[PDB]
Amino acid sequence: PTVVGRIPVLDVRPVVQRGRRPAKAVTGESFEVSATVFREGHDAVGANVVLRDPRGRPGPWTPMRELAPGTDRWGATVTAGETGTWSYTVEAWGDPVTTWRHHARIKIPAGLDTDLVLEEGARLYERAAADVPGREDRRELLAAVDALRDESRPAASRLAAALTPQVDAVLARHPLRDLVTSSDPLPLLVERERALYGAWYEFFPRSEGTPHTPHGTFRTAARRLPAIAAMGFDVVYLPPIHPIGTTHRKGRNNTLSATGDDVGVPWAIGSPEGGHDSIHPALGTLDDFDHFVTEAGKLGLEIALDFALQCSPDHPWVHKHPEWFHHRPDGTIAHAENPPKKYQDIYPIAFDADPDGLATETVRILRHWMDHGVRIFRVANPHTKPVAFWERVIADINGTDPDVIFLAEAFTRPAMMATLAQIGFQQSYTYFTWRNTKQELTEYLTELSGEAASYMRPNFFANTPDILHAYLQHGGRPAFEVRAVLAATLSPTWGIYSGYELCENTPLREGSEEYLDSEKYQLKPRDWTRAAREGTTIAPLVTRLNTIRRENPALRQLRDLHFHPTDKEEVIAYSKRQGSNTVLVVVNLDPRHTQEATVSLDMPQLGLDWHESVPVRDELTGETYHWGRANYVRLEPGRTPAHVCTVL
Amino acid sequence: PTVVGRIPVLDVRPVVQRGRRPAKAVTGESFEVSATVFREGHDAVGANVVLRDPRGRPGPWTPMRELAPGTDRWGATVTAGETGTWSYTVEAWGDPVTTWRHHARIKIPAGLDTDLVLEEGARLYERAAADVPGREDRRELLAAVDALRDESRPAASRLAAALTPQVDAVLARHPLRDLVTSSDPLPLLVERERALYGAWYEFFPRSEGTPHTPHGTFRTAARRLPAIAAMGFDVVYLPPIHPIGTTHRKGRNNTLSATGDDVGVPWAIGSPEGGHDSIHPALGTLDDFDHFVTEAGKLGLEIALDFALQCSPDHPWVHKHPEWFHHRPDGTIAHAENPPKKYQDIYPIAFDADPDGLATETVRILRHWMDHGVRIFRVANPHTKPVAFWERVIADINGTDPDVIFLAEAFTRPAMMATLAQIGFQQSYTYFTWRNTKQELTEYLTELSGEAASYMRPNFFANTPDILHAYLQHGGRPAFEVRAVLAATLSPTWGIYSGYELCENTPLREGSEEYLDSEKYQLKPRDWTRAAREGTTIAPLVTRLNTIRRENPALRQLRDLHFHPTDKEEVIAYSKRQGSNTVLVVVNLDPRHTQEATVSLDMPQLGLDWHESVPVRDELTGETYHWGRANYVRLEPGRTPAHVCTVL
Ligand SMILES: OC[C@H]1O[C@H](O[C@H]2[C@H](O)[C@@H](O)[C@@H](O[C@H]3[C@H](O)[C@@H](O)[C@@H](O[C@H]4[C@H](O)[C@@H](O)[C@@H](O)O[C@@H]4CO)O[C@@H]3CO[C@H]3O[C@H](CO)[C@@H](O[C@H]4O[C@H](CO)[C@@H](O[C@H]5O[C@H](CO)[C@@H](O[C@H]6O[C@H](CO)[C@@H](O[C@H]7O[C@H](CO)[C@@H](O)[C@H](O)[C@H]7O)[C@H](O)[C@H]6O)[C@H](O)[C@H]5O)[C@H](O)[C@H]4O)[C@H](O)[C@H]3O)O[C@@H]2CO)[C@H](O)[C@@H](O)[C@@H]1O
Ligand SMILES: OC[C@H]1O[C@H](O[C@H]2[C@H](O)[C@@H](O)[C@@H](O[C@H]3[C@H](O)[C@@H](O)[C@@H](O[C@H]4[C@H](O)[C@@H](O)[C@@H](O[C@H]5[C@H](O)[C@@H](O)[C@@H](OC[C@H]6O[C@H](O)[C@H](O)[C@@H](O)[C@@H]6O)O[C@@H]5CO)O[C@@H]4CO)O[C@@H]3CO)O[C@@H]2CO)[C@H](O)[C@@H](O)[C@@H]1O
Ligand SMILES: OC[C@H]1O[C@H](O[C@H]2[C@H](O)[C@@H](O)[C@@H](O[C@H]3[C@H](O)[C@@H](O)[C@@H](O[C@H]4[C@H](O)[C@@H](O)[C@@H](O[C@H]5[C@H](O)[C@@H](O)[C@@H](O)O[C@@H]5CO)O[C@@H]4CO)O[C@@H]3CO)O[C@@H]2CO)[C@H](O)[C@@H](O)[C@@H]1O
Ligand SMILES: OC[C@H]1O[C@H](O[C@H]2[C@H](O)[C@@H](O)[C@@H](O[C@H]3[C@H](O)[C@@H](O)[C@@H](O[C@H]4[C@H](O)[C@@H](O)[C@@H](O[C@H]5[C@H](O)[C@@H](O)[C@@H](O)O[C@@H]5CO)O[C@@H]4CO)O[C@@H]3CO)O[C@@H]2CO)[C@H](O)[C@@H](O)[C@@H]1O
Ligand SMILES: OC[C@H]1O[C@H](O[C@H]2[C@H](O)[C@@H](O)[C@H](O)O[C@@H]2CO)[C@H](O)[C@@H](O)[C@@H]1O
Ligand SMILES: OC[C@H]1O[C@H](O[C@H]2[C@H](O)[C@@H](O)[C@H](O)O[C@@H]2CO)[C@H](O)[C@@H](O)[C@@H]1O
Numbered sequence A, B: 001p002t003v004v005g006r007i008p009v010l011d012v013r014p015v016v017q018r019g020r021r022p023a024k025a026v027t028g029e030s031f032e033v034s035a036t037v038f039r040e041g042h043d044a045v046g047a048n049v050v051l052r053d054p055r056g057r058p059g060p061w062t063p064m065r066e067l068a069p070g071t072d073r074w075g076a077t078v079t080a081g082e083t084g085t086w087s088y089t090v091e092a093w094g095d096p097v098t099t100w101r102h103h104a105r106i107k108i109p110a111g112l113d114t115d116l117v118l119e120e121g122a123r124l125y126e127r128a129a130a131d132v133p134g135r136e137d138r139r140e141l142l143a144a145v146d147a148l149r150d151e152s153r154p155a156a157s158r159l160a161a162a163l164t165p166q167v168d169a170v171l172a173r174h175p176l177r178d179l180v181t182s183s184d185p186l187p188l189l190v191e192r193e194r195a196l197y198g199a200w201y202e203f204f205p206r207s208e209g210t211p212h213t214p215h216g217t218f219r220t221a222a223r224r225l226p227a228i229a230a231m232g233f234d235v236v237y238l239p240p241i242h243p244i245g246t247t248h249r250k251g252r253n254n255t256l257s258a259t260g261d262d263v264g265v266p267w268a269i270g271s272p273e274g275g276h277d278s279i280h281p282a283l284g285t286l287d288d289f290d291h292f293v294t295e296a297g298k299l300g301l302e303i304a305l306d307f308a309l310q311c312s313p314d315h316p317w318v319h320k321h322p323e324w325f326h327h328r329p330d331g332t333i334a335h336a337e338n339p340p341k342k343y344q345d346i347y348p349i350a351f352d353a354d355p356d357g358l359a360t361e362t363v364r365i366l367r368h369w370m371d372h373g374v375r376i377f378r379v380a381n382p383h384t385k386p387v388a389f390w391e392r393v394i395a396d397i398n399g400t401d402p403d404v405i406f407l408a409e410a411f412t413r414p415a416m417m418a419t420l421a422q423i424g425f426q427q428s429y430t431y432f433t434w435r436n437t438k439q440e441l442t443e444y445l446t447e448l449s450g451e452a453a454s455y456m457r458p459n460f461f462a463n464t465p466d467i468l469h470a471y472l473q474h475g476g477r478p479a480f481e482v483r484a485v486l487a488a489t490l491s492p493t494w495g496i497y498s499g500y501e502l503c504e505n506t507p508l509r510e511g512s513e514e515y516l517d518s519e520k521y522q523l524k525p526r527d528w529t530r531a532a533r534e535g536t537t538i539a540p541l542v543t544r545l546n547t548i549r550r551e552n553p554a555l556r557q558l559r560d561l562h563f564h565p566t567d568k569e570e571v572i573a574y575s576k577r578q579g580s581n582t583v584l585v586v587v588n589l590d591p592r593h594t595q596e597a598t599v600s601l602d603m604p605q606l607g608l609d610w611h612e613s614v615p616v617r618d619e620l621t622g623e624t625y626h627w628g629r630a631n632y633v634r635l636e637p638g639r640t641p642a643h644v645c646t647v648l
Helices: A096-110 A114-130 A135-148 A155-161 A165-173 A218-230 A286-298 A355-371 A387-400 A414-422 A438-449 A470-490 A528-534 A539-551 B096-110 B114-130 B135-148 B155-161 B165-173 B218-230 B286-298 B355-371 B387-400 B414-422 B438-449 B470-490 B528-534 B539-551
Strands: A009-013 A023-026 A030-037 A045-052 A073-079 A084-094 A178-182 A186-191 A198-202 A235-238 A302-307 A336-338 A341-343 A376-380 A405-409 A493-497 A562-564 A571-578 A581-588 A595-600 A614-618 A624-627 A630-635 A642-647 B009-013 B023-026 B030-037 B045-052 B073-079 B084-094 B178-182 B186-191 B198-202 B235-238 B302-307 B336-338 B341-343 B376-380 B405-409 B493-497 B562-564 B571-578 B581-588 B595-600 B614-618 B624-627 B630-635 B642-647
Touching: A009 A084, A030 A045, A030 A084, A045 A073, A096 A114, A096 A155, A114 A135, A114 A155, A135 A155, A135 A165, A218 A286, A286 A302, A302 A355, A355 A387, A387 A405, A387 A414, A405 A414, A438 A470, A438 A562, A438 A571, A470 A493, A470 A539, A470 A571, A470 A581, A470 A642, A571 A595, A581 A595, A581 A630, A630 A642, B009 B084, B030 B045, B030 B084, B045 B073, B096 B114, B096 B155, B114 B135, B114 B155, B135 B155, B135 B165, B218 B286, B286 B302, B302 B355, B355 B387, B387 B405, B387 B414, B405 B414, B438 B470, B438 B562, B438 B571, B470 B493, B470 B539, B470 B571, B470 B581, B470 B642, B571 B595, B581 B595, B581 B630, B630 B642
Parallel strands: A023 A186, A198 A235, A198 A493, A235 A302, A302 A376, A376 A405, B023 B186, B198 B235, B198 B493, B235 B302, B302 B376, B376 B405
Antiparallel strands: A009 A030, A030 A073, A045 A084, A084 A178, A084 A186, A336 A341, A562 A571, A571 A581, A581 A642, A595 A630, A614 A624, A614 A642, B009 B030, B030 B073, B045 B084, B084 B178, B084 B186, B336 B341, B562 B571, B571 B581, B581 B642, B595 B630, B614 B624, B614 B642
């Protein structure tokens, strides 16, 4: 057998690791399938995409078109349906009718061999009619056949009967396909909506306590959930909820010795009170956890738990499974590091003595939390554990529970970040916090919305407990507003860490991205009621952004994104589309100074002609404008961080 | 099982059609194997390439290096040996010694756990010594172990004993490799030197006749071979040598009706005198063909025959195999076309009624000519026959006779041209004749010498009987000189069609690339002796170019090519290297005006420091210059078309 088939169909995309891992989508998401399709000689080709669902049933007729003339690159948009493992194939074929029509349109007016030409047409159309399933379509084609063969009609009339719009519509749906050749099937993994789209809020339950009991419980933290749901969040991400070690517990501001009252770091998991399958006693019991999960569910909030495969020196694993750790020649275990960061309060796990034991235990733990309603896991530092370990763990969990979503917190080099997404992580943290200039945002979002979208789903956290960017430090509230608009409108998934709304921006020291008095090392009570009363919170903006996202399908997808030129370096403009919904955003990246700019819209990318003027509504203010190809904007920090406009 | 192994090794290149077809090389040719290699955590990785020969035997130790810092892209140069089907694998591994050294160089001066660190080193070096085959290398490592453990030496001295150049040399050859993980093997097809490197000369034997018999024979045409060999050619390409049809024979200058004396076109193959396995009676017999092949061989010339799968209406196939043709409804067969070109003198072949019969007959024909010493075929218009047909034919022929070279004359779109090379064509015609400006040449050669070199070998014909470019038409002799220098120095395979040496450049009409009074349609006697005597031939330049190529290995490869900036649009500069051989070419593309320029050499690409000044010899003149990073050149049409320099 030959590698190339009768009609060449080559380099089908998307493809991930040469077909060894699936391309990704979620239910209702569109993307392009493409291929290089051509044939020998000068006659025309056609192509179509066959999508097969998890039961092997083919999807609808999906013809492709040549994407640019003379390139031989063909494409079609497909839309993912129900969740599961699908496949896609490109079918390529000679299109003899298109070729015959091209020649007949020339030869018939010229009087060149008109009887042969028309009989040749008649034979193609009768072959077309024989493959057509519907009676009325067949009759339409056969009437064209009879007209083509009718020697009593003028040549031009015989030809015209074969080129009618009604004949065209039949042949667009059921073309005559010669020498049909298929690509080898490629896999598509279709996952639930939340894998791509959702707003996330991170907070520490222990910080939501009372004057009588400063250490919050699941019951006290549950009373924070209504405010989180009212800001329009969908997912609450909790730091580790397990007992915390005492040996080498860290003190406040990342100091090495805890005092007697110090709470330690939740990531220093494990004590004689229990490990990763247990609840910190000060948070309450598993029954209290269940209450928290249930109250979250009532308010439209899913819980994401941190899963950090590491432990404190007091974790039961340390003496039960010594082979899960690297021991130095004196028998001791070195503390974990992620240079220049040091984690003196924990041991890292070693994987090569007992990989099977570790995987078995990992999936036991995850299934325990899954049985208590946790269907999302934020996986801590996955890039410091083996790639194939995650591949195995995720395949095991998703094999019985395909709805479970894993988020990779891998702030590392591009090859590792991409590979983790490709081996099964549904979502990835990103470089978003370090992309702040127009050039940085433009380049990075062009990457994320391009080929990477076949395997990676970005979660844009504007801050985390480990990342307070200088932009926020120096820009104050106007900068928090800008980064919220950007995160919420550039990615279908975004998030914030509690305190972002209050514009907390005091760093540990100059040149650090750590918070002063970080919540990782201490209880951090916040007077939410006071901040709301005093108007010192951007919760209203956050709430509005989430409402805009919920009302505009364009903001609930990733791949359709276009940057429009402006004449100011500090002003960025972009549009997103989904069906008839178009959102147009203009952001002033300068948190200190008012910017005036001309935004020049690429009108064809909005589906409009260059001369058109179309109404927009800025959803942040309710103000309506009329914008054409060139529009003045004025954006003032503290009043108008951005325009977030719908086309009406 | 998991897709990713213990140490990730991904996206191995080169790759062709995702590993379904081989990457290519020839004996003695170097190229780069690369991969993306990294691991979890912060410890170091290593990698190496394992090349396996046709008997499965591994090549030498071939360590890779990271190609640019922080990219995780690793590479090594490999060199192809004997012809056949090879494979290559990338092996990736943890490099614990490099990691330990990095930590020890920090921790030992700091006084941080120095006894543990040194003992840990001792145990690694012991493990390294256990895998080392040479006794002297083992003793070197074990002496380092004993020094590491020697508590009577200062800490810094214990460490330094493990970092000596002699220890380094052992570990460069036999590193301690943890967790060795392999890519899946990729195929490499290694072919003979001539597939990549050779100078080609096309001529029509029938034009080399005598006053007594104007239609040349193989015996008269053989007397042209000494001049061809003396110009330094390696391959003589003959147009079709078979009987020529009478029905619809073309007249002179592509007219539709032949007169009584008209010879017709050699591509109109076949008559009752025979088909593709026969000799035109006016050329003589098969015994005369054998004489011509034998005389060619004595002069170091291989014959390439045209193979054109098509025929005249008088070919025996027409009535013997009607199913090898497309018949219209009245039973007639339409003449072949390649729009806007019409081939009224031939029928094209149809492939879908009897593909097996056609393949069987095609390989019969090729094997016939192979039995008469023809080991190279110039395949006419392969892109008008099915791609999979050629894939099958070439695999059949190369299965018994892997030395046979097929050249694809496919002037068509890029997808088809690439695919034909990928399915088995050893060489390809190219866009060379339509790349004449500095920008065109630079861009096109960057493509050919880059990734395309894994599957395509270009044959740069400066002219053909179908292509007299306007550049040559308007530029005259100075333009013929420029295009010869370019073709001969940019590709390891180049060629000319007879008459190029005489600067024949009269077109059929303005705006055509056809020759006036084309040799395709008429006998074309040339007075070779006169042109040489009158100095109106560029044969001496052609001869010199071929001698330079034969003396400079840099010109017998494709992939190593670098363009150097000049400050004039009409002056192009490039270098090629192979081992210690470096050739530096500067060409004036203006055939009308003298150009003065500053050529600014990228000195690192010549393997030199920026401040160096190195002697060169212009091999066209024998003149010696001293060139550094910025050099004045003056190039005058009719005197100095170019400098073709060797570094001394
Ligand atoms: O002469 C009348 C005109 O003179 C005046 O203007 C010219 C300047 O004097 C001259 O310097 C040059 O200007 C440069 C300028 O210096 C440079 O900074 C730059 O400027 C540009 C800016 O960088 C840019 O930012 C922007 O602003 O634009 C600026 C303008 O372009 O580039 C200018 C242009 O240079 C380029 O074009 C010119 C013109 O086409 C071209 O030739 C002229 O300059 C060269 C070098 O300066 C002169 O050559 C002299 O030096 C060489 C080197 O020694 C002498 O050559 C002798 O030795 C060599 C051996 O090395 C020998 O050659 C043999 O070997 C070589 C291989 O090595 C073979 O290739 C040869 O075949 C072989 O023979 C040679 O035989 C021997 O003679 C030479 O004799 C000296 O004369 C030329 O004479 C100039 O014509 C230049 O190379 C190119 O780089 O150009 C100005 C003209 O535009 C007046 O202002 C003007 O009005 C007068 O009409
Ligand atoms: O569309 C949404 C928009 O709606 C509301 O805006 C109102 C606005 O309140 C109202 O006043 C009016 O806008 C007028 C404006 O009043 C008027 O002054 C004039 O604006 C010019 C402006 O005063 C002047 O400083 C300058 O501004 C900048 C340019 O816009 C910008 O393109 C840039 O140009 C720099 C140079 O670049 C090259 O070198 C070039 O060769 C050279 O020619 C350029 O000068 O920088 C300028 C200064 O830094 O030019 C302005 C002209 O456009 O005209 C405005 C247009 O009507 O109406 C709008 C409603 O459309 C709402 O208040 C606002 O917040 C919201 O954004
Ligand atoms: O006798 C036939 C023909 O021979 C000679 O043509 C040769 C060209 O001179 C030479 O460059 C090469 O052409 C290739 C080309 O290099 C390659 O890129 C591809 O061209 C594609 C374009 O890539 C594609 O964009 C599209 O071009 C558009 C263009 O973008 C648009 O702006 C506008 O100008 O219309 C164009 C046409 O749709 O399509 C072309 C393909 O149609 O393929 C080319 C080969 O087809 O090789 C040619 C010979 O094969 C003579 O120069 C020419 O006069 C003769 O007609
Ligand atoms: O907590 C650690 C770290 O966090 C923050 O860094 C983040 C960066 O701000 C952010 O941009 C991102 O960095 C990525 C980077 O985007 C990505 O391209 C890759 O970087 C490679 C380069 O591609 C590669 O060329 C090479 O860089 C060379 C450079 O070309 C050369 O000119 C010269 O400057 O040396 C450089 C270093 O060799 O290597 C780097 C890899 O080191 O990967 C980066 C990630 O490693 O994400 C960072 C967090 O993951 C803080 O900003 C930083 O201060 C903290 O130390
Ligand atoms: O208790 C261990 C360390 O916890 C934190 O570091 C976390 C980080 O907050 C989290 O985002 C990431 O996923 O994991 C690391 C490692 O656990 C503190 O920042 C450290 O100071 C603690 O040592
Ligand atoms: O006799 C058929 C045609 O032959 C020539 O065309 C050749 C061309 O010269 C050759 O390089 C290519 O490989 O094949 C074509 C087609 O045979 C003449 O140029 C045509 O006029 C003839 O009709």
